[PDB]
Structures are given as C-alpha cells and as structure tokens.
Amino acid sequence: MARCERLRGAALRDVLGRAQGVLFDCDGVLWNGERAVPGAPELLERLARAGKAALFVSNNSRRARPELALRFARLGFGGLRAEQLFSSALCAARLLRQRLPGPPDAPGAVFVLGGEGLRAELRAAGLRLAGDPSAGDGAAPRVRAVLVGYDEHFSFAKLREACAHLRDPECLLVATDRDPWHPLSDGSRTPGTGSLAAAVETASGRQALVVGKPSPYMFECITENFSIDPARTLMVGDRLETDILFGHRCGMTTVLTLTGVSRLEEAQAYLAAGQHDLVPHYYVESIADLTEGL
Amino acid sequence: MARCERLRGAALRDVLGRAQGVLFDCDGVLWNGERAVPGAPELLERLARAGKAALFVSNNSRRARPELALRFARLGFGGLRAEQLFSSALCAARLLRQRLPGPPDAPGAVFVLGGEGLRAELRAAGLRLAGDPSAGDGAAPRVRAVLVGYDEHFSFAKLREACAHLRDPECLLVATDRDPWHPLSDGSRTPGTGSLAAAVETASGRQALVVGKPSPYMFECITENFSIDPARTLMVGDRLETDILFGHRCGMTTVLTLTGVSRLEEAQAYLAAGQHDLVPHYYVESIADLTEGL
Numbered sequence A, B: 001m002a003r004c005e006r007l008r009g010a011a012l013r014d015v016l017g018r019a020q021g022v023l024f025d026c027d028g029v030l031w032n033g034e035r036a037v038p039g040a041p042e043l044l045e046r047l048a049r050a051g052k053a054a055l056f057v058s059n060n061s062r063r064a065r066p067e068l069a070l071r072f073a074r075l076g077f078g079g080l081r082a083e084q085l086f087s088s089a090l091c092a093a094r095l096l097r098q099r100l101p102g103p104p105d106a107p108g109a110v111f112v113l114g115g116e117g118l119r120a121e122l123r124a125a126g127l128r129l130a131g132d133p134s135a136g137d138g139a140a141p142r143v144r145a146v147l148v149g150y151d152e153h154f155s156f157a158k159l160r161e162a163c164a165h166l167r168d169p170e171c172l173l174v175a176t177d178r179d180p181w182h183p184l185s186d187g188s189r190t191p192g193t194g195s196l197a198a199a200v201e202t203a204s205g206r207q208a209l210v211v212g213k214p215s216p217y218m219f220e221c222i223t224e225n226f227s228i229d230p231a232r233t234l235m236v237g238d239r240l241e242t243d244i245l246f247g248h249r250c251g252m253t254t255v256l257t258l259t260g261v262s263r264l265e266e267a268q269a270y271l272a273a274g275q276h277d278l279v280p281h282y283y284v285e286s287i288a289d290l291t292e293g294l
C-alpha cells in the first residue's frame, strides 16, 4: 500500500521507466500563481523526448480551453495540444451534455453559479443557460440542472434562486469540484467551489454530483478520446484530498509534490491513521526532481 | 427515554401540572409567516392564569428585541415583557461581549455577516463593528471576531473578507445558529444561517462557535436573569435538530409541535434508529392541544 516514500535514485528510474504517461495536476504543481516551478518546463520536454504521454487535469474553472492553452505557453510549457488539457469546466460541460434530464424535443437549461470561462465551456458543449434570451414566444426553458462552480459573484439571492430550481427533485445538482479554498501569493486564501457547494447543499438538502477530482468521472472525461492504462499512468498532484485520492480511486501510482497546498506532515498523519487512500505512494520536493529519472 | 408519545388526556394534565414553566420556540410554533397558530394566544393566557412561566427562544436574527416584542403583540400575544424574549441575535451579542479577545484598553471589532436587527443588538451590547467609523487618527480597530448570521446580502467578497480576518487564529468564528433553511408561505425555502456558516467554515478551515439552539449556550443566556429549573421546564418546538436536541442537552421535557418544519415521521425514524437525542418526549398537532391540560 502507499507508504509516502521519497522518490529518488534507482526507484525513480524504475517508476518513470515503467510509466507510459504522466497525468499532472496544474495549480501548485507546474506553477504557483504566475510563477512557473523552476525546472517544470524542462521535465515536460524530457518526458516527450522519452516517448511518454503527458496529460493535464485541473479543478480550476477560470479558463476555457483556449485561454488555458495560452497560459501553458506563457509559462514555458511549449508544444502542447489543447486536447491534452482537462479542466473541471470542460468536464462539467461534457457531463451535463451527457446527463441533462428532459425530452430531446424540448431541451432544458442550466442555472450556472460561475464565471465567463465556465459559461463559455458550457455553451461550446451545446448547453443552454438560464438567463439566456428566450425565443420569440418568451416562454423560458425549464431549468433542469444547477451547476456550482467558482463564482466570484456568488450572492444570497443566487443561492436562494438555486434552491428554487432544486425544489424539483428531477433537477440535477452538479458541482465542478469541492476544493474548499485556494492559496494566494501573499499567504491569504480565496474561497473555493467547495465552500459554495457546501452552502447550496446545506440550503437545498441535496447532495451534489461532483465532476472534478477526486471524482472518477474526471478520469472518464480524460480517457474518452485517449487510451491510457491507469496501471501505467503516474498521477502527480499537490493536494491529498483531491489529486492523491483521485489517483487511488483510478488505480494510478500517486506522487505528491510539495510545491503546493498539502504538506508532507499531513500525508504522514494520514498514513499513521491508516487512511491509505489519502497517502501518496511517493513524494518529491518539486516535479523538477523527476527529470533525473529519465 | 423519549418515545415520541402523543400528549393527551391525563398524561397531558400531569405533564403541564408538574411544569413550572414553558419555553417556546417561535417560528413554526406560535405562528407561520404572518399567521398566528389558531389557539396559541389563548394557551399563553391560560398558562399565565395558571401561574406558569413562559419564555421564548428563537434562532431568528431578523428582529432586535423591540421589534420582536411588537411582533408578538401584533399576532395576539399580549401582556408580554421584552425580557421574556430571547433571540440568537441577542444571545450572540451577549456572548461576544463576554468572550471577545483582546486587551481592555484597546477593544476589538466584530466583522458581521448579517442584517440591521442583528447589528442593532450587537451595538446595544457595547460591541464595535468592522466598518464603523474610525477615530480621528484613522487606525481601524483590529477585528477579533467574525459573526455569521442570516445575511440577505451575503457575497463571495464578504466570504473572502471573513477568511482574511480568520487567518488570525485568535480571531473568533461565531455563528448565530446553524438552521439550514426556512420555509416560506408558498412552499419554497430561503437559505438559513447554517448554509452561510457552512461556506465560511469550509473556506476558512475553522469550526464555528454556535450561539443558538441546539447549543446549550442559549439556555445560559435565557437563565442569566431568570431562575428556571430545566427539570421543571417544558421545551416546545417544531424542529427536531434544533429545538428537541436543545431540550435534551439541557435536561428538559421536550414537546414537538407539528405546525412547523419537522414531521412526525422524521421523529419516528430517529427513534427507530436509536437516536434518542433527536426524539421528542411528546408531540402535539399544534400547541392549541396543550390548553386542555390546564
């Protein structure tokens, strides 16, 4: 079982050599804020030269895929295809397209708590949004899902409206992710989707369907058009309760990097408590430590 | 132990006869919205004639005591003294006065998520509020508590500011109550303080000190200036997880009335699960059924 081993030396060469690809979390792993982790671009160049696949998975719903791709480029991660990038905004849009209730001749609408990147992904997946213009008649389409994402304009009034839609038990409640908070450059924090979802769940008495990590649905989304054997995929993340748990639920070897949210002492406390699904198989100080294994 | 018995007949006469007073929840018990429960004013008149004390305890922080007293009068509950009325706004103000950290020569301020009734109670207890004017110097007083109450103007920005104050581990986190939602006249619901507290707790990683029912602190607040033996006090409420649990924690005989939030079938499900602290000793269809026991 996972034992939180510092990955180095021959073990590092063997782990990377057997892996067919690496699935990276983004925030706290490749970068912090607008600062790339030193050595991270060089790791990705060496992985490619070694013929290993690289895929990326983020619970951040700020950027639709085109704006996410440009961010990778800007921070030194060249040569990437947009098809390698998976965010909770993209995967939430796809899940709603796959699962929205209602008849095909009278499609429903999604009431969205979230920002313009998230809304852009929803529309690109064909979803109609509550508040969008009504047809000439004026009869607004029925709301058949509430989607909670990172919403800098969250308000009591929006929370109460979500509850009104959720009075219909057939209306879905979906959340992009459950991350509770995110660190800012000065050591402060900003509230995360999980804090807003907690309010929506508590007021409505409903449990949300979570799209993002640690839900295995995110691995379904990533693998819809790319064949990756989870038994041959390394999952690299900074957050025990999202990235590492995700990896265990999907059957991947997990690596905690220490440049982000979770601390080594937390992983060790989970191991001492026997909570092995929150323990990484391996850790590194930063992902630059992986390059030597190639 | 509590067995959820319908209270009637000789048992009703004995239970009321042995009681020295009755502690009533307000919303869902005395009234629904702006409609008084039929017979409820007459019960309170008969209790007084019988020499039994009546006290009132609400988690609603909309009304400071003067506006709460006028509401009782308007709905037919005459002859009451404001000193009989205890809301989570009043008791939160008193708790903050008793527990606010900081030196006596440089008192702190309270960052409040809540409305004007709540703020009025805080000021009447001597508390200074974040955002109040600064002294001539301009140096704003340090925020030493965050208070979450029912906040119709809750926003992501206010949530993020609360988190900034809570970065100081000595800054208290207090909530007026944890009620998750409240029913409206048309069967919709409005979010409750517990939904907002859930967001604040989740984003900050803190657990709130809850003032209102089911916290026993509310019974400390009620009894500060009135001597009531809990062993001789009947607790009458409509909400299992707040009023009935409160009664059990304080050692009172509990009565569920069915004119409000909780349903008889819920109480029976808790009893079948052995969760006796959420089971009322007795129930009535409405508190008008108690009058015959006098």
Ligand SMILES: O=c1cc(-c2ccccc2)oc2c(O)c(O)ccc12
Binding pocket: A027, A059, A060, A061, A062, A063, A115, A150, A151, A152, A182, A183, A184, A190
């Ligand atoms: O999902 C989001 C996550 C974050 C985030 C902020 C700091 C560190 C890590 C993640 O910021 C966002 C944001 O600024 C938006 O406008 C919209 C969405 C998000």
Ligand SMILES: O=c1cc(-c2ccccc2)oc2c(O)c(O)ccc12
Binding pocket: B027, B059, B060, B061, B062, B063, B115, B150, B151, B152, B182, B183, B184, B190
């Ligand atoms: O604490 C409060 C509880 C409620 C409430 C609403 C419906 C049924 C029962 C309780 O409404 C409030 C309100 O409208 C305010 O403006 C301020 C505070 C509250």
Ligand SMILES: [Mg+2]
Binding pocket: A025, A026, A027, A028, A029, A237, A238, A239, A260
């Ligand atoms: Mg991360």
Ligand SMILES: [Mg+2]
Binding pocket: B025, B026, B027, B028, B029, B237, B238, B239, B260
């Ligand atoms: Mg009540």
